[PDB]
Amino acid sequence: YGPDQRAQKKGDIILGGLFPIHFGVAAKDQDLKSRPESVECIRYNFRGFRWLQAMIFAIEEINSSPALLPNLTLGYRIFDTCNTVSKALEATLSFVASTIAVVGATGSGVSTAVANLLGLFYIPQVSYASSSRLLSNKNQFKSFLRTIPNDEHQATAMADIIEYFRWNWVGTIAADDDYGRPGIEKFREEAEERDICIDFSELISQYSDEEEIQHVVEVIQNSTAKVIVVFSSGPDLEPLIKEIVRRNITGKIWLASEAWASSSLIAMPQYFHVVGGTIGFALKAGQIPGFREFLKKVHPRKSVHNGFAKEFWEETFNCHLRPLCTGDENISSVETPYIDYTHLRISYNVYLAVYSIAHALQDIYTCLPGRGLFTNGSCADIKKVEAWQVLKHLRHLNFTNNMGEQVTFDECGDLVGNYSIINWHLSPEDGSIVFKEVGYYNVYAKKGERLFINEEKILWSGFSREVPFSNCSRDCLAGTRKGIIEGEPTCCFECVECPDGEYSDETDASACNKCPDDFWSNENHTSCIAKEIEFLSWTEPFGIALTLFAVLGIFLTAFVLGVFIKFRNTPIVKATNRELSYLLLFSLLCCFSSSLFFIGEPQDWTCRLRQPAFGISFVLCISCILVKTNRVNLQFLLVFLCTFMQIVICVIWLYTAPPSSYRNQELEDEIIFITCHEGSLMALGFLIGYTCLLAAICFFFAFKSRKLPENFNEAKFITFSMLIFFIVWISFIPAYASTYGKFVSAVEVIAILAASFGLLACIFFNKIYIIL
Amino acid sequence: YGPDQRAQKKGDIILGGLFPIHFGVAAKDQDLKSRPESVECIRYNFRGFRWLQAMIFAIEEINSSPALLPNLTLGYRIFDTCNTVSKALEATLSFVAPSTIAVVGATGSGVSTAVANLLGLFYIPQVSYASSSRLLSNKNQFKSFLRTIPNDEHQATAMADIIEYFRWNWVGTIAADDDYGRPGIEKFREEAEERDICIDFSELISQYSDEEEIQHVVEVIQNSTAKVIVVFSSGPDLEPLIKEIVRRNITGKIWLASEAWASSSLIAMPQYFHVVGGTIGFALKAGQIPGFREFLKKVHPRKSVHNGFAKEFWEETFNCHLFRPLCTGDENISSVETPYIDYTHLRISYNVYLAVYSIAHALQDIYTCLPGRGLFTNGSCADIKKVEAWQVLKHLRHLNFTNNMGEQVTFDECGDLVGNYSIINWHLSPEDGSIVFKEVGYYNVYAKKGERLFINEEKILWSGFSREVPFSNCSRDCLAGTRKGIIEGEPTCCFECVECPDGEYSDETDASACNKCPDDFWSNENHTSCIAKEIEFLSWTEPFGIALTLFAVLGIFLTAFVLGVFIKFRNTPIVKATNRELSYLLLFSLLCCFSSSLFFIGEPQDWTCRLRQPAFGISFVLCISCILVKLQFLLVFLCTFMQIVICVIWLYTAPPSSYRNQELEDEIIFITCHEGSLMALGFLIGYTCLLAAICFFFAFKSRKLPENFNEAKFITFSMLIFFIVWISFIPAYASTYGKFVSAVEVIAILAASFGLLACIFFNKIYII
Numbered sequence A: 001y002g003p004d005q006r007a008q009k010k011g012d013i014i015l016g017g018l019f020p021i022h023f024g025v026a027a028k029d030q031d032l033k034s035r036p037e038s039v040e041c042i043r044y045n046f047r048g049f050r051w052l053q054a055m056i057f058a059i060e061e062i063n064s065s066p067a068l069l070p071n072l073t074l075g076y077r078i079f080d081t082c083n084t085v086s087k088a089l090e091a092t093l094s095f096v097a098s099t100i101a102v103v104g105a106t107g108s109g110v111s112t113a114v115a116n117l118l119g120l121f122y123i124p125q126v127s128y129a130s131s132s133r134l135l136s137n138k139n140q141f142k143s144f145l146r147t148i149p150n151d152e153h154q155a156t157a158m159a160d161i162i163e164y165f166r167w168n169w170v171g172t173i174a175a176d177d178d179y180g181r182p183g184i185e186k187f188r189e190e191a192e193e194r195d196i197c198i199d200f201s202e203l204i205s206q207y208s209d210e211e212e213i214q215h216v217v218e219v220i221q222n223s224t225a226k227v228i229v230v231f232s233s234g235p236d237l238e239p240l241i242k243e244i245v246r247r248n249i250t251g252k253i254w255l256a257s258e259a260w261a262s263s264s265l266i267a268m269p270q271y272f273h274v275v276g277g278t279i280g281f282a283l284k285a286g287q288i289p290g291f292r293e294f295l296k297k298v299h300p301r302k303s304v305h306n307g308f309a310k311e312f313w314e315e316t317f318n319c320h321l322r323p324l325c326t327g328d329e330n331i332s333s334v335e336t337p338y339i340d341y342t343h344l345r346i347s348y349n350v351y352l353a354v355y356s357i358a359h360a361l362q363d364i365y366t367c368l369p370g371r372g373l374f375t376n377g378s379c380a381d382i383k384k385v386e387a388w389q390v391l392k393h394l395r396h397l398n399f400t401n402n403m404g405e406q407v408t409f410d411e412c413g414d415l416v417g418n419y420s421i422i423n424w425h426l427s428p429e430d431g432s433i434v435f436k437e438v439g440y441y442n443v444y445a446k447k448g449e450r451l452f453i454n455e456e457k458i459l460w461s462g463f464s465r466e467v468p469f470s471n472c473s474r475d476c477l478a479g480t481r482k483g484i485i486e487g488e489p490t491c492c493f494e495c496v497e498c499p500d501g502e503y504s505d506e507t508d509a510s511a512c513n514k515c516p517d518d519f520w521s522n523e524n525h526t527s528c529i530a531k532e533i534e535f536l537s538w539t540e541p542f543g544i545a546l547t548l549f550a551v552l553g554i555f556l557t558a559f560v561l562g563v564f565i566k567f568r569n570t571p572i573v574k575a576t577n578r579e580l581s582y583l584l585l586f587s588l589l590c591c592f593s594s595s596l597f598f599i600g601e602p603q604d605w606t607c608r609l610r611q612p613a614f615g616i617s618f619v620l621c622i623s624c625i626l627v628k629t630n631r632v633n634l635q636f637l638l639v640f641l642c643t644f645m646q647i648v649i650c651v652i653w654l655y656t657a658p659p660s661s662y663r664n665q666e667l668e669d670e671i672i673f674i675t676c677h678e679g680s681l682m683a684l685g686f687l688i689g690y691t692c693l694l695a696a697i698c699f700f701f702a703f704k705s706r707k708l709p710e711n712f713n714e715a716k717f718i719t720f721s722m723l724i725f726f727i728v729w730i731s732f733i734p735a736y737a738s739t740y741g742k743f744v745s746a747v748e749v750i751a752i753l754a755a756s757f758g759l760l761a762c763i764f765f766n767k768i769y770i771i772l
Numbered sequence B: 001y002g003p004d005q006r007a008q009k010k011g012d013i014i015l016g017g018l019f020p021i022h023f024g025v026a027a028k029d030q031d032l033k034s035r036p037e038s039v040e041c042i043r044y045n046f047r048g049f050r051w052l053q054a055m056i057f058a059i060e061e062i063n064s065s066p067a068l069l070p071n072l073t074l075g076y077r078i079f080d081t082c083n084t085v086s087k088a089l090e091a092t093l094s095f096v097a098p099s100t101i102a103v104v105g106a107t108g109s110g111v112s113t114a115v116a117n118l119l120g121l122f123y124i125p126q127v128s129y130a131s132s133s134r135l136l137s138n139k140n141q142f143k144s145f146l147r148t149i150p151n152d153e154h155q156a157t158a159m160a161d162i163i164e165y166f167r168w169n170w171v172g173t174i175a176a177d178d179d180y181g182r183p184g185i186e187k188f189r190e191e192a193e194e195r196d197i198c199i200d201f202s203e204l205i206s207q208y209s210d211e212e213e214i215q216h217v218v219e220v221i222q223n224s225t226a227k228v229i230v231v232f233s234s235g236p237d238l239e240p241l242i243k244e245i246v247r248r249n250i251t252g253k254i255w256l257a258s259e260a261w262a263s264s265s266l267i268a269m270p271q272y273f274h275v276v277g278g279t280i281g282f283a284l285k286a287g288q289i290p291g292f293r294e295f296l297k298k299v300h301p302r303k304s305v306h307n308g309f310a311k312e313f314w315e316e317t318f319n320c321h322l323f324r325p326l327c328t329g330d331e332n333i334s335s336v337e338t339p340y341i342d343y344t345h346l347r348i349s350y351n352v353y354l355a356v357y358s359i360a361h362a363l364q365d366i367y368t369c370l371p372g373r374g375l376f377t378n379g380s381c382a383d384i385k386k387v388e389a390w391q392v393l394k395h396l397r398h399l400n401f402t403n404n405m406g407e408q409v410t411f412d413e414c415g416d417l418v419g420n421y422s423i424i425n426w427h428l429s430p431e432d433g434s435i436v437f438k439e440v441g442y443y444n445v446y447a448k449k450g451e452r453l454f455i456n457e458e459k460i461l462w463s464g465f466s467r468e469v470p471f472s473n474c475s476r477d478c479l480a481g482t483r484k485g486i487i488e489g490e491p492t493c494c495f496e497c498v499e500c501p502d503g504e505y506s507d508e509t510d511a512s513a514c515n516k517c518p519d520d521f522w523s524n525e526n527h528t529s530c531i532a533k534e535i536e537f538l539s540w541t542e543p544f545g546i547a548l549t550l551f552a553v554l555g556i557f558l559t560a561f562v563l564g565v566f567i568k569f570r571n572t573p574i575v576k577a578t579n580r581e582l583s584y585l586l587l588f589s590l591l592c593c594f595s596s597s598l599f600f601i602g603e604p605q606d607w608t609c610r611l612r613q614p615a616f617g618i619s620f621v622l623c624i625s626c627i628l629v630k631l632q633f634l635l636v637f638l639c640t641f642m643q644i645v646i647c648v649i650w651l652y653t654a655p656p657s658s659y660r661n662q663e664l665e666d667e668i669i670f671i672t673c674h675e676g677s678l679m680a681l682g683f684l685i686g687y688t689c690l691l692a693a694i695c696f697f698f699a700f701k702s703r704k705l706p707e708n709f710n711e712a713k714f715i716t717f718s719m720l721i722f723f724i725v726w727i728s729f730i731p732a733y734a735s736t737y738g739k740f741v742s743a744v745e746v747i748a749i750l751a752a753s754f755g756l757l758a759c760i761f762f763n764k765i766y767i768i
């Protein structure tokens, strides 16, 4: 028979309906000491009553209009589910015990149970609010069609919003039923496809225990993420919100699904300091003329067909039929969600479901023999119509709304729809919560072009304007790279500085970069500068300071030669071998010239001659000075033999292993020296040793004859010059052995100039002075 | 009402049952051109028929029992579900319409949910034997559901435990899109995230999935690189994907099976063994029912009047009709190989047995009571004549009894039992080629968190014919010389091995960042451990140190010998020619100046480098003061006084000390002692040079003279060698750094001192 409380009217064709007039059942749990009784409902639902009114209005208008079903009256039989499976199953047993269509339930689990029962007898069921993707399976739910889309697009939209605002550190919360779980799974898949890290994920219910509530609250508090995505309804979300308000946890960003984005259970001013600035999804609104007047024309006395109106009035005016009420009140004098609304969405879905059933019936009525949807093109009988025939016509139906929009059901009985994005604000007039549109979501568009948000219209946490931060890690700038933190996701990391020789340019770099082998890292490891070249050369202090002196010395020896040629007749110049003084002076010229190879860029030919040139010149000079004394042509044989021995040594050295240039970068890694090694060391030792031996022989021979004052005391000055040569060579040995930079080149030229100047002066100063 | 074929008997109390005698319905595109008819299920289920026989046997045993419910008969009313929700609601609508007191539940979790929604309306107890979904464990929605099987939270935790125990971190998952696979896979995902395990892919399958979906799932499996796949499904829902994978020949995966298909005969076939061999799965505890095999063998299409499925069972077993040939109801049931009588362990059959006996024990507890000792309001009882379903449910909630083995059976506040698990492995029969499941472990539940799993490796064949544990990590481990690096867009599971730079090292094998050892250390070439920094200074053991020491000691003894010969020959007129006392003091000062070069040897200490310079300054100023004059001790003291002043005030102000150089090289440290303030060192240098220059001038003023054996030019030469040797020092001092700065220092000191001694005392020594 069904529950006593009902709405019912008599007609030729009867329609069923299920609406949640209450929010749930009483908390008392029976221990089965006595006979179980009927469980009672506790809280009222003005929105659900409005939905029921919408269905009744649609049926009454259909019966009024003589263009949809002439000569045919439609009846209804509507019950209350109280948001629970047990009460909705009792009514469905009365439906199948006749109705040809049922306007479905609100919750997904309730709709699943009702559809399981109703598909046994092929009674079509049109739901207005159940959006679970599990109801699209046509192998299980053979009679289920709906006027609302499923939540795959809504989860994709949540991921799109998260990617738009550039967050990667979020938490999720879902209700423990067929609405929350599939939605949170689809969101998890999309988020992991978009590289988003989820911190925690918990479940809740309207009948959750205190320990579970505390545990969820403590997880939320212990987490460091700020954005929380919630897939639930108001009845299942209220206890957690109450506990969170009690614990005073603020500063979080909420992303709501459509089921509670506009719920009056949560949108309370006492909670606004926690759930302010909420961003959610809301479906498209429709328009139904005359509906508000129909709603305000309710009365427990003239609504004989309706039964819930008595309890409606009692819970509206707080009376009984706690003072007694005369029934003369006004619904406009009390503030309830009943007539206080701005947009109708699920009421419009109710309207659409009723009109879908009516249009299928009219399609059955109109068809002509031979042009049918049944076997042999036959046409159904309107006076004996059946539920399966109505279901077939519903699966082959499309029509046009009152706004000119076209309604078509797909192969899964699903429709396609648009979403809108709203933000929660505080009304400055009375402190109530107002829902302000800030965007939308387009489903007919392509991937990546479905979402539009006006950020300037969004208030964050209710009273701010700066986009929040939820990332688990502050990005580190150039010159540093990311480092793994163990046991944590990829979104959380530490940054460390890049070492020498490597650098990073772009932010959020996972590895430093090495510059090619002519560069070095900067001071901050952001750009690799050029490797500085360093070597003694011209246009530099030491180079000019040394060649200017080389030019001065070459001019001095040229002048000396000029004085000698001019005075080629004075007897003082005579008895000093004219054939050997010129050779000595020209060798001095050559030594001064060879002192110029040591300064410059070390090409492969400068370093093949810079040493042998000076060796040859000095051996020639010492050979000249070792025979110039008459206490010994045949004298030219000595200079020729000495110079030829030296030349032989240098040529065999150059044949076995010529020296070459060398770019040096091993001593230091920031500056690269271009200094040329000598190639071989035994031959260099030969070259040095021959000259040192000749110098020693000359020193000994001159030390033999110091006392003689003939020839202006030649031997003493010879000893002086050989001495200065020897000490100036000995002094710089550690510098020669500690080759570091460009100082080694300078000391070579210093020694060359010192020795040559000493020899020239000690030989010719007195001779020129007495001459002039 | 209800289906035509059924099992039914008469009694005072009637029991309901639901068993899957078919694997599913003949699905087809039913266009609604004509009135829809009843659908027909196709594939016969011998295991389901065995479960039905277990229920019937239990009821017959209870009726034969005199102790349990005497003078009372139990009846039954059993239907077939064909594994579908539609065919189970048709049967349930007759249960709630002789009244039914209890129903032995269904197999599938979704079917059980749909049935329980309707049975809890009338408070009819429902005891399921195979539904293990955790959604059925909340008592707000399901008021009269109990089960003789545990729920899947323990199984998911055990799967995570096994994965962690075998050291894998790269897996994929596959589930069935029903109330069984999804919550189980979700619990597994949470456990694996807790245990730091990585999931590559996660797909859904169904018995009625399409070709495109099956090929897409196969392509996901082939594209992925993981080897271990965790599956939460049943045989009917898993068959199509397995057949497609077998056709495409994808070999080399590791399968971890839940108890629904771990022993399923649909998947365990020799043809598929090359894809699903070496499967590791779960199984419940096995029971013992002593008189069950004979009862099963006693089936007959004519003697079993009360059984309606016996005729179809016979037809499917013997391929005949009651063109399929005619048959005789006298064949042998032992000559055909079907899962009917062929089995080693009864698990779901034992659960069916336990459900029936638990309902019986609740009824007996109702029957025997003492007034004032009842479970109802005023201690009163019910009556077995007019017992009711809610009273039976109350007693079932307050039931606690022991089975035939001797184990206590009781239900908690959620209606669930607790039970053990066994771990099995799929092998190949060496005699028949079939698939034989061999026990390899178990999973305790009464143990504390972390000691529940026991596994014995050596009994496992990994791919079917392999004896080595497979590798299923995203990337290979790093070494001690290298650390891991982040790959952008990929999880923390796989990485790249990046070598540490100079000055840093790593020790472990999975280091995420390599540190650095403190000062006086440096990383080696292999970057595994770091050697200590090498110290460097002019050491005595070094040959240069020994050479300088011998030179200084030789100079010391030479001056001592000169002093001794002067003292002994103090009567020679040549000693009186010059001053004897000044010669003595000058000799002692030359001794001091020679010995003052031993401070430049060894590791600089706090005082040594605070005295190396003042000693030489004082000694050389005395020596040159002696030469200049040569009373006179007054002038030598006056000349030394200002040097003493400068050195002592410098030591008071900024005493030098040893300093360590760590910023010049990498593996070599230097101890080059500070010079303090450069002003005092420069003042020392300048004053001693000025005195030497004054000596040079006053010696060159009278360089030509024969007195004192013509020594003025000798003094001039000594000062010349002093100046030149201390001038030809900067080009070797500025351009050299290291252990050579304190190497030519001693050279210059010794050269100057030896010259000063030889240019003076040699002539006077020669004549003597």
Ligand SMILES: *[C@@H]1O[C@H](CO)[C@@H](O[C@@H]2O[C@H](CO)[C@@H](O)[C@H](O)[C@H]2NC(C)=O)[C@H](O)[C@H]1NC(C)=O
Pocket: A163, A166, A167, A168, A469, A470, A471, A473, A474, A475, A508
């Ligand atoms: C928070 O993290 C997100 C995600 O990594 C960052 O957004 C990225 O920013 C970089 C650098 O500009 C862009 O190249 C990426 O395209 C962004 N990702 C996305 C998905 O758009 C964001 O910059 C981070 N914010 C802070 C403050 O660190």
Ligand SMILES: C[C@@H](NCCc1nsc2ccccc12)c1cccc2c1OCO2
Pocket: A611, A612, A614, A615, A687, A688, A689, A691, A692, A729, A733, A736, A737, A748, A751, A752
């Ligand atoms: C000026 C001198 N150059 C020798 C450079 C040198 N000497 S030792 C050492 C150690 C390490 C590195 C370099 C060096 C020279 C050249 C040619 C003939 C010579 C001669 O001097 C004697 O005859």
Ligand SMILES: C[C@@H](NCCc1nsc2ccccc12)c1cccc2c1OCO2
Pocket: B613, B616, B617, B620, B684, B685, B688, B689, B726, B729, B730, B733, B749
């Ligand atoms: C032995 C020396 N003390 C250290 C001198 C010194 N240290 S670094 C340096 C660099 C360039 C030149 C000199 C130095 C010394 C002491 C007193 C008088 C001296 C004298 O030498 C000249 O007269």
Ligand SMILES: N[C@@H](Cc1c[nH]c2ccccc12)C(=O)O
Pocket: A106, A107, A108, A109, A129, A130, A131, A132, A179, A233, A234, A258, A259, A260, A346
């Ligand atoms: N879509 C929700 C039902 C729902 C939609 N809008 C609502 C508003 C209030 C309450 C419930 C709802 C579900 O599947 O369960």
Ligand SMILES: N[C@@H](Cc1c[nH]c2ccccc12)C(=O)O
Pocket: B107, B108, B109, B110, B130, B131, B132, B133, B180, B234, B235, B259, B260, B261, B348
């Ligand atoms: N546990 C499975 C049912 C099940 C258990 N063992 C089985 C063996 C075969 C078939 C089904 C089953 C479920 O809840 O759905």
Ligand SMILES: *[C@@H]1O[C@H](CO)[C@@H](O)[C@H](O)[C@H]1NC(C)=O
Pocket: A398, A399, A408
């Ligand atoms: C929708 O209705 C139109 C009439 O405007 C009809 O032509 C069409 O076949 C119907 N179906 C679809 C899928 O467009």
Ligand SMILES: *[C@@H]1O[C@H](CO)[C@@H](O)[C@H](O)[C@H]1NC(C)=O
Pocket: A418, A440, A441, A442, A443
């Ligand atoms: C959905 O929204 C988009 C963007 O505003 C619009 O173009 C489209 O027409 C809308 N569709 C419907 C059916 O309203």
Ligand SMILES: *[C@@H]1O[C@H](CO)[C@@H](O)[C@H](O)[C@H]1NC(C)=O
Pocket: B400, B401, B408, B410
């Ligand atoms: C069930 O009975 C046994 C046997 O006496 C007893 O040990 C056990 O505690 C009982 N169960 C409960 C839940 O009390």
Ligand SMILES: *[C@@H]1O[C@H](CO)[C@@H](O)[C@H](O)[C@H]1NC(C)=O
Pocket: B419, B420, B442, B443, B444, B445, B446
């Ligand atoms: C489960 O296994 C453990 C360890 O093997 C054992 O102690 C325990 O008795 C088992 N449980 C049952 C019910 O047999």
Ligand SMILES: *[C@@H]1O[C@H](CO)[C@@H](O)[C@H](O)[C@H]1NC(C)=O
Pocket: B167, B168, B169, B471, B473, B476, B477
């Ligand atoms: C795989 O990874 C785990 C977890 O990081 C590690 O312990 C194990 O040693 C790895 N296995 C191999 C074979 O490298």
Ligand SMILES: [Ca+2]
Pocket: A062, A063, A064, A065, A066, A067, A068, A069, A070, A071, A072
């Ligand atoms: Ca009409």
Ligand SMILES: [Ca+2]
Pocket: A018, A019, A020, A081, A082, A083, A105, A106, A107, A110
């Ligand atoms: Ca409802």
Ligand SMILES: [Ca+2]
Pocket: A047, A234, A262, A263, A264, A265
């Ligand atoms: Ca609401």
Ligand SMILES: [Ca+2]
Pocket: A487, A488, B193, B194, B195, B196
């Ligand atoms: Ca972790």
Ligand SMILES: [Ca+2]
Pocket: B062, B063, B064, B065, B066, B067, B068, B069, B070, B071, B072
């Ligand atoms: Ca009995």
Ligand SMILES: [Ca+2]
Pocket: B018, B019, B020, B081, B083, B084, B106, B107, B108, B111
């Ligand atoms: Ca079943």
